[PDB]
Fold:
Amino acid sequence: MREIVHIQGGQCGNQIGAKFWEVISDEHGIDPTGTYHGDSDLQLERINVYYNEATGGRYVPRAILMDLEPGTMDSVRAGPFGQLFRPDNFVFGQTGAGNNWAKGHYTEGAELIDSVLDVVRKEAEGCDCLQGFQITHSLGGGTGSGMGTLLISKVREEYPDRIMETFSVVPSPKVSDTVVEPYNATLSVHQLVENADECMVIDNEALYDICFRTLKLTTPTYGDLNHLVSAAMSGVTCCLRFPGQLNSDLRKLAVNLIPFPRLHFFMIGFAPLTSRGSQQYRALTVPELTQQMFDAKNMMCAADPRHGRYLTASALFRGRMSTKEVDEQMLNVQNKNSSYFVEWIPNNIKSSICDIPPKGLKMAVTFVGNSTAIQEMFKRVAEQFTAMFRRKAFLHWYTGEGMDEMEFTEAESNMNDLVSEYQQYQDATA
Amino acid sequence: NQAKSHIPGYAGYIPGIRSENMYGKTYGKITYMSVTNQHHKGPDLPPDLRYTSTVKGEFTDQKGVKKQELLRQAVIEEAKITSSGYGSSPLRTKY
Amino acid sequence: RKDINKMYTQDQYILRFEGKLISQNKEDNHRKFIISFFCGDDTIMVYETAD
Amino acid sequence: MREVISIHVGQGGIQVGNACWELFCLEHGIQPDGQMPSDRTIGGGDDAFNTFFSETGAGKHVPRAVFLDLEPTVIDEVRTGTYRQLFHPEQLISGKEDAANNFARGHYTIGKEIVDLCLDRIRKLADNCTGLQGFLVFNSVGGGTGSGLGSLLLERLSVDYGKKSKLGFTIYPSPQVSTAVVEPYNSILSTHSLLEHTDVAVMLDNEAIYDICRRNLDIERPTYTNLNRLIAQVISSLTASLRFDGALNVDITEFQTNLVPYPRIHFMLSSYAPIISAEKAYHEQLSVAEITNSAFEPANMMAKCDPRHGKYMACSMMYRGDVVPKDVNASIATIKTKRTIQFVDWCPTGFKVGINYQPPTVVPGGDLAKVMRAVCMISNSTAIAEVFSRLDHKFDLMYAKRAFVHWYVGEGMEEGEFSEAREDLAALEKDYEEVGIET
Amino acid sequence: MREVISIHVGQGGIQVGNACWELFCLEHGIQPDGQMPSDDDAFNTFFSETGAGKHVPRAVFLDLEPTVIDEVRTGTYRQLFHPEQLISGKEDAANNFARGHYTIGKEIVDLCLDRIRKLADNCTGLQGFLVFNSVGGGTGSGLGSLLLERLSVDYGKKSKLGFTIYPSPQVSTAVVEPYNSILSTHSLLEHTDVAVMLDNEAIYDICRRNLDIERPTYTNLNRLIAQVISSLTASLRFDGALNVDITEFQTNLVPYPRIHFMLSSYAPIISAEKAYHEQLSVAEITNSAFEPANMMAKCDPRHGKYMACSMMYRGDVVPKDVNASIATIKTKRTIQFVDWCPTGFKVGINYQPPTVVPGGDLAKVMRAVCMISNSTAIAEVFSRLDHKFDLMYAKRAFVHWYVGEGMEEGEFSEAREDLAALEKDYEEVGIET
Ligand SMILES: Nc1nc2c(ncn2[C@@H]2O[C@H](COP(=O)(O)OP(=O)(O)OP(=O)(O)O)[C@@H](O)[C@H]2O)c(=O)[nH]1
Ligand SMILES: Nc1nc2c(ncn2[C@@H]2O[C@H](COP(=O)(O)OP(=O)(O)OP(=O)(O)O)[C@@H](O)[C@H]2O)c(=O)[nH]1
Ligand SMILES: Nc1nc2c(ncn2[C@@H]2O[C@H](COP(=O)(O)OP(=O)(O)O)[C@@H](O)[C@H]2O)c(=O)[nH]1
Ligand SMILES: [Mg+2]
Ligand SMILES: [Mg+2]
Structure:
C-alpha cells in the first residue's frame, strides 16, 4: 500500500540501483532466487511497497533500468541479485549519447522515451495507490542528464499530484573526469528546478573523503560508495516500511523541509560510521549519534554548512529508543548552535522514530537538511560554465542538432536568479 | 552480596547504565537488571530481540509480567533477609 | 487503626457464591441470590438476580 | 444505564486510547479475548462495565469506541496485537493516505470521504445506548490529520446531536520542545475551530508530564507509554464516579454547571497526586492532607503553566479510596487560608468535590505503586492565557514572511483564513484579562 | 505529639548523625529494617509511624560531596532513612566559605527548604530544631549558616539549639579554618538560640584518660556526642520525676540574648574492665561532671565565673541525695559563681537508665548525668582564634580564594568587629557590681 515505483537512468544510476536493491533484499530477507526466507513476521506485511508478487510465490522489484548502451545492463544483470529484475523492464538503445546533453535530450531522447514511458505508465496504473517516484542518476553524464530530465518532465506533466524524489550526482571540481561537465550539469539543473519536488545532492568528493578518513580503509571502491549511498537512501523510507513511535513519509518530509517551492535542494548523510578497528571502543548512544551526525565533515556534500545557516532540518532515528534523548539533544544542539540556525523560524528540526534497526546495527540516524551553504556548488559550476562558454568552446557539438544559444542564455539567467534568491534568505532577518 | 538494586537518589556508577539504554523502567528495576545481568549487551541483535516494536514487545500480555514481578520481589527479599541478631549491624567496622 | 498489610496482599482474592434465602415468607423461597465475600477486609456483599 | 462514547483521532489519540482501554479492561476484569476469565462461571452481577462496554448477549463485551486515522500502520498494529479479538473489526476506521502534518489536507480534501463512515459508525454506536452521557475526544493537535478530522468531526457533531456534552483532551505542543516545525499553523486553526464547538477542554502538553515523570517516578528515560498510562489514570479517576458507588457522585454534566463561568472561557488545566514509585511509596502515610497539598503544587502541573501568575475561577477535585469528608473539608479550609494561592473576587467559594470508594487500580508492568488515596483536580485559571500568548508569538514571527503558506493554499484553503484565526485568538486573549481584573 | 527535628550538614554532621540515629534506634528497639520487632508513643518524638509497621526518622542530611552520603545509601541502614531526605550535591565547597554561601549553596538550599516544610507540616507539636555542623569546613559552615538565616525568617520563634565543632587550639586539619570560623560565628550569633562547644581535642583526652584506648577514632568520638544528645533529650519522651523541655533551656540558661554560648560535660565515663570497682554513687558522678579535666570543650572553668548550670539525671537517682550534692558543690570554694545569680541550678530527673551499644565502649551503668553550663570562661576560645585570624589576615593570605567567589573584601572586617564586641560583652558581664 502507498507504494513507490523505482526508475533509474545511466550507468551511475544502474550501479546505484544494483547496490540499493541488494540492501533492500537483504533487509527483507530475499534470496537471489526471489524466495522469502525471513525469520520474523514483521518482514512481510509491507513488502508490497518495493516488490510485486508473481505466480509461484516469488517477488520482483518494481524497478525499470534504462540506458543508451547495453554494456551496463549486461554487467548489472550478471551481478548478485541480478536475476530479480524482470527482463521486460530493461529498455536500452543501440547508439549511446556519449556525454552530450543535446544528443541525449533531443535526437535520441524523443524517439526512445516512448517505450520507457509506456512501461512506467503500465507500472503506475497497475499499482494500487501510488505514493510517488524516486530517481537515481548522475548529472555529469550526457545520456543520464538528458533522458532522465526529459522523463521527469513527462512524468511530472502526467502525474502532477504524486511526489517526486531525486538523487543527483553533481560533478565535482577537484576530481573531474570529463570537460563537458558544466554544460550538461547546468542544463540538467535548469530542467530539474522546475519539476523536482525533492532533490538530494551526492558528491564523489564527499564519498571519497568519508571512506578515506572515517572508515580508514586504504583502497576504496565504487562498491563501497554505492553501499554508503544505498544505506543513506534506504534510511529515508525505512519508516514507511516499518512501524515506529512517530510515522513519517516523503510527503511529510517535503512539507516540513521546503518553505518555498523553489528551495528543494538538500544535503544528506548517514550515521554512525566507524572503522573495524575502532568499532569496539565507541559506545552507541543517541548523544554520540547526533554528535557525529551534525558534524560538518560527515556530510555527503563538499558544501560546508558552517559557511551558511540551516534553513530547516530533519532527523530520522532508527531503532528502539526513548523520546527523552532525541528531543533533548535536538533542543540542546539547537540552543548551543544558535549562530548556525536561521531565526525567523523557531524550532526548525523534525524528528521521527522507527523501531526496526538495520541488520547488523542496533541504532542508526538518517538526516536530511536544507541549508543555504549548498549554493556554492551552483556558484562554482556556473563560474566554470561561463568561463568556458565565453569563448564558445564545444558549442558546435551542441548546436549541430537543433539547440541554440538562447537556451544556454536562459539557463544561465534562471540559474543565477535561483542562486541569488536562495542566498537572499541567508541574510534575511526577522 | 550487595542488595540487588539501590535507593533512588544513589550517586555512583551502575556498570552499563548508559551503554545499552534500559529506558522507560523505574530505576530500582533498572539497577536490578544491571547487577543481575538480564540484558543483551554488545552492538548486535539476534532476530528474537529485534522485530519487537514497543507495542508488540511490551504494553501487552495479561499476567506473565505479574508472575515475573513477584519472582523479582521474592529474589530481592531473600537476598536481603540474610541479616538478623540482636547485635545490630557491624557499623563500626563497615563505615 | 486499620490492618493495612492484610489489605495489600489479599485484595485480589474474591469469593463468589450462589445462594438461596430461608425465611418464613412463602413468596421468597424460590428467588436466588449471588453472595460476594471480599476477604481483603472481611466485607460481605449480596446481589439478587432477576429472571 | 449510563454510557459514554470515546473518540480517538490521530496517532496520539490512538496511542492514548490503547492505554485507556487496557486500564479499563484490567479494572473491570476484562481479558483481552473479552470473557471475564474463562474460570469465573457465575457473573451476572454489579453491572458497572456498561458505561464503557456493551454486552453482546452471551460472553464477550465490545467497547463503545471508534478509532480514526489516515496512516494504516497504527491501525494494523492494533489489529495485530494481543487485543486482536477485543475490538470490533470495522469500528477501527483507517484511511489510505496520510495528511502529512497539513491542516488543509485533513480539513478540505481527504477528511470528507472518511467523515461519512465515521458518522455512520457513530450513529450505529449511539443507537445501542440509551443514557448517553456525552462524548470524549482525544486528538493530537500538532498533527495534520488529527487537527483536521477533529475540527470536521466537532463541526458535524455540533449539528447532528446538538446539546449533547463533548469533552476535549487535547495535546498542545510544549513551549520549547516539539517534534514538527509547522505545528503553529494547524494548532491555531484547530483552536479557532474548537473555540465555539467544545464544551470543556483540558491541556495535556508533553513537557509537563515529562517533568512529573522524571521527578516522582525517578525515570531518566521515559517514553510515550508512561505518558499514556498517566493520562489513562487521570481519565479513569475522572470517570470512576459513574460506575462506582461513593459518598458524593459527580457526573459529566456536573462540570459545565460548576466549573465553567462563561461559554467562551472553557480552557482548563489538570493535576494528579500522588505520583510515587513503589521503591519509596511505602515510607509515607500518604495522607489526604499531603496529597491535596501536592495537588496544588505548581510543579505537579500537567500543563506548562504556572497558576501563581494568575487567578483561579473554579476548581473541581475528585477523591477515590478511603478518604474522609471531614479531612477533605479541613484540607480545603487550609488551602483556602493559604496566602500564596488566591481566588478571583467574584467567586467566593470555588470548590466542587466528589468522593468515590474504589481505590485506584494498579497495572502490573507499570510505574506507579498501588495506594489507598488519590485526587484528580481540574481548575480554571486566568494564567492559562500565557500559553496562547506565547503561541501567538511563534505564529506571527514566521507568518510575517509567508512561510509554508503555499502548502496550505494549494490544497484548496483560502489564503485569508489565517487572519480570522488570528482575530479569534486575539479576542479570546482579550476576554481573559477582562474577567481577571477585580470589580 | 511533641517532636524535635534534627539538621545535619557537612560530613561531620552526617558522621555524628549516624551515631546518634543508631543510638536512638537501639534505645527505642527499632530494627535497622525500620520494622518494630513486635511485642506507647515514646518513639513519636524522633520517629513517625507510617500507617502500618515501619517508622521513618525526622531527619535531613545535607552535603555537597556525595562520598559520605553514598556510604549511608550502601550501608546497613539503607532501608531506614527516607530516600529523598539524604540530599547530596555535586561539587564540594572545598574548604571555602564563599563557595558554599554565595555560589554553589544557593541551588541546593531550596530543595532543603521544601523538604523541611514537608517534614514540619506533618508534625503537630513541633518543639524546635537541632543543628549539627562543622564550622571549620566549606559546606558545613557556608550552607549551614544559609539554612539558619533562612529558617530564622521562614519560621521565626521556633527554638534552635546548636551543636557546633570549633577547631582545637593546636590540633587541626586545615590552615584556613580561622577564616570561615569567624564568618560562621558572625552568622550564628544573631540567628541561633543556644550554642554548645564540641571541639575535638578535649574528647581525645577523655577517651585516653578513661576508656583506656591508645588509638581512638572519630567513631569513638561520635558515640559520646550521641550519648550527650540522648541524655539531653530523654525527658521529652521518657517518664521521670521532673521533666524538662527544650523551652527550659530557652528560659533558664540565657540571661541575655547576646550571651547564649555554653558548654557540655558527661559523667560517669568508664570502661567495662574497671567499671565494677566503684560504687558509682550519685555524689561521685556529680563531682566528675564538675571536674575541669572532664570537660568536653578546651576551657578552664577556674579562669572564669558561672552563670547557669542545667544538669539532667537519668537512672535510679532519688531527689533527696541529689540536693546534698549541689549543697556540697556550693560549699566547695574552687567553684565560684557570679554575684547577680544567687540560685543557678535547674535540675531534671528521668527514670530511663542509659542504654549500651553492642560493640561499644562505655559500660552498662545505672546512673549518669549530663550537664550544660553557661560560663564566662568560654570567652577564652574566642581570644586565641581571633589571634590566629589576625596573624594570617595581616598579610592578606588566601584572600583571593574568597574574593573570586563573589564575597566582598570588607566582609572580613565586620565579622572581626562582632567577635570583638562579643568579647567585650562577656568581659563586662563577668564583672561584679
Ligand atoms: N503525549 C503524547 N503525544 C503524542 C503521542 N503520539 C503523538 N503525539 C503528538 O503528536 C504529534 C505528531 O503528530 P502525530 O500524532 O504523530 O500524527 P497525527 O496527529 O496523526 O498527524 P499526521 O502526522 O498527519 O498523521 C507530536 O508532536 C506529539 O506531540 C503520544 O503517544 N503521547
Ligand atoms: N569529631 C569529629 N569531627 C569531624 C568529623 N568529620 C569532620 N570533622 C571535622 O571537620 C573538619 C573539616 O571540615 P569537614 O566537616 O570535614 O568538611 P566540610 O565542613 O564539609 O567542608 P568541605 O570539606 O569544604 O566540604 C575537621 O577538622 C574535623 O575536625 C567527625 O566525624 N567527628
Ligand atoms: N557513486 C558512484 N558514482 C559513479 C559510479 N559510476 C560512475 N559514477 C560517476 O558518474 C560520472 C560519469 O557519469 P557517466 O558515465 O557519464 O553517466 P552516463 O552518461 O549516464 O553513462 C563520474 O563523474 C562518476 O563519478 C558509481 O558506481 N558510483
Ligand atoms: Mg500522524
Ligand atoms: Mg567537607
Remarks:
- The first helix of chain D runs from residue 10 to 28.
- Chain D touches chain E at residues 279-280, 282-286, 290, 293 (CB under 8 Å).
- Residues A 247; D 10-11, 71, 143, 145 surround magnesium ion (ligand 4) (CB under 6 Å).
